[PDB]
């Protein structure tokens, strides 16, 4: 039984999302539908992604590193490689374990990109493993085509490039035909100013491998993402509330669910066309969440795009397998 995949602490402040590793504080309905594969598991014990259910480091030993111009001081460092070149990754060769499933947002000069996945790290020497210490910075990572001259976002891994570019000037730029990338897997969201932006990533920014099943509305049941509070570059101190607006990152699954799914095969527990349902009991009222065999979560919220605050969630109780066509209860 999948019942213990989702227990009360998973959604009441201990559980984190599988994209940003932020504490989950809300449920974000996606009436338009979405797809996610990276660090996403199904109930048949499998992933279409390239990442294990953890947040460690991103490591790739063979990419092209460069900076523009003839002055090496305070420059934007650019790193890129082909998708499918991650030979050292046992899960998938598509990308290094932990590389974010987000499309690259191009920028140059003094522009800081909006809604990029950003991580801290730098370039290192492919021949001996030594870091290029003058290249440490915050880097936006994403999938693109057209690097290095004109990188543009792409949402498919097939034929893509994996790109890292420092959003601020590094101490001294480095030009290497072959160089390593090392970036911490726990990301923040890039903003050019103190203002928060919409939940990130939006569905059209998510990068997916071929064959990734889509999450679509089933009747009045709508797929959701799990909203967490995520740091943003424009106002790094900002956390939940009051301070200049709240920034949400979103993930397809709670990481504890992803971990459990990765350790187990739940094929006997649930049939296709079924949800495993939990009841979420709030201080006043309650709602149901449903989990499909493809590993997507649903709510009975229909066309609504309004975020559901989990601040008053009290406990979670298993309901069991139900028809995916049965509208999930929403009494909030």
Torsion of CA 197, 55, 144, 195, to 10 degrees: 10
**Does 134 help bind a second copy (rule: CB under 8 A)?**
yes
Q: Which stretch binds a second copy (CB under 8 A): 30-38, 57-65, 95-103, 147-155?
A: 57-65
Min dist CB 199 to a second copy, Å, is: 18
Out of Cl ion, a second copy, none, what residue 318 binds, judged by CB under 5 to 8 A for its kind, is: none
Min dist CB 105 to a second copy, Å, is: 17
Min dist CB 131 to a second copy, Å, is: 5
Exactly one of 3, 91, 184, 216 binds a second copy (CB under 8 A); that residue is 184
**Does 177 help bind a second copy (rule: CB under 8 A)?**
no
Report the alpha-carbon distance of residue 104 to residue 153 in Å, rounded: 5
Exactly one of 30, 95, 224, 238 binds a second copy (CB under 8 A); that residue is 238
Min dist CB 305 to a second copy, Å, is: 28
Q: How is residue 205 annotated by DSSP?
A: G
210 by Cβ neighbours in 10 Å (0-12 / 13-18 / 19+) ranks as exposed
Report the alpha-carbon distance of residue 160 to residue 178 in Å, rounded: 18
Q: How is residue 5 annotated by DSSP?
A: G
Place of tokens 């998510």: 206
**Does 121 help bind a second copy (rule: CB under 8 A)?**
yes
Q: Which two tokens stand for residue 13?
A: 């402040």
Exactly one of 29, 35, 61, 157 binds a second copy (CB under 8 A); that residue is 61
Out of Cl ion, a second copy, none, what residue 97 binds, judged by CB under 5 to 8 A for its kind, is: Cl ion
Which residues are CB-neighbours of 257 under 8 A, at least 6 positions away? 5, 6, 10, 15, 18, 291
Q: Which stretch binds a second copy (CB under 8 A): 39-47, 152-160, 170-178, 266-274?
A: 170-178
Angle formed at CA 101 by CA 172 and CA 128, multiple of 5 degrees = 40
Interface of this chain with Cl ion, residues 45 to 104, rule: CB under 5 A: 89, 96-97
**Does 19 help bind a second copy (rule: CB under 8 A)?**
no
State how far the alpha carbon of 273 is from the alpha carbons of 20, 264, 315, 317, in Å: 29, 20, 26, 21
Report the alpha-carbon distance of residue 190 to residue 164 in Å, rounded: 13
Min dist CB 244 to a second copy, Å, is: 7
Out of a second copy, Cl ion, none, what residue 89 binds, judged by CB under 5 to 8 A for its kind, is: Cl ion
**Does 14 help bind a second copy (rule: CB under 8 A)?**
yes
The footprint of Cl ion (CB under 5 A) covers: 89, 96-97
């Amino acid at each position: 039984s999948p019942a213990d995949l989702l227990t009360t602490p998973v959604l009441t402040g201990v559980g984190t999302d599988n994209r940003w590793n932020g504490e989950i504080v809300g449920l974000q309905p996606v009436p338009g539908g979405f797809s996610t594969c990276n660090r996403h598991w199904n109930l048949n014990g499998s992933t279409f992604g390239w990442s294990s259910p953890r947040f460690a480091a991103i490591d790739h030993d063979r990419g092209n590193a460069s900076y523009p111009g003839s002055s090496s001081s305070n420059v934007l460092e650019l790193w890129y490689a082909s998708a499918g070149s991650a030979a050292d990754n046992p899960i998938s060769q598509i990308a290094p374990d932990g590389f974010p499933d987000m499309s690259f947002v191009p920028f140059s000069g003094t522009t800081v990109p909006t809604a990029g996945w950003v991580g801290f790290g730098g370039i290192w020497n492919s021949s001996n493993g030594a870091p290029f210490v003058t290249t440490v910075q915050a880097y936006e990572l994403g999938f693109a085509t057209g690097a290095p001259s004109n990188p543009q976002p792409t949402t498919t891994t097939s034929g893509a490039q994996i790109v890292a570019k420092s959003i601020y000037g590094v101490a001294t730029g480095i030009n290497q035909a072959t160089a390593g990338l090392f970036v911490m897997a726990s990301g923040v969201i890039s903003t050019p100013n103190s203002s928060a932006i919409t939940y990130t990533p939006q569905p059209n920014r998510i990068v997916n491998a071929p064959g990734t099943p889509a999450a679509a509305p089933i009747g009045k049941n709508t797929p959701i993402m799990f909203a967490s509070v995520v740091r943003r570059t424009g106002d790094i101190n900002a956390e939940a509330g009051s301070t200049n607006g709240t920034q949400y990152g979103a993930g397809s699954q709670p990481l504890p669910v992803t971990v459990g799914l990765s350790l187990n095969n739940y094929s006997s527990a649930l049939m296709p066309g079924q949800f495993f349902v939990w009841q979420l009991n709030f201080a006043s009222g309650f709602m149901e969440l449903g989990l499909s065999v493809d590993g997507y979560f649903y709510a009975g919220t229909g066309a609504s795009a309004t975020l559901i605050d989990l601040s008053e969630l009290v406990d979670i109780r298993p309901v069991g397998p139900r028809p995916s066509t049965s509208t999930l209860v929403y009494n909030l």
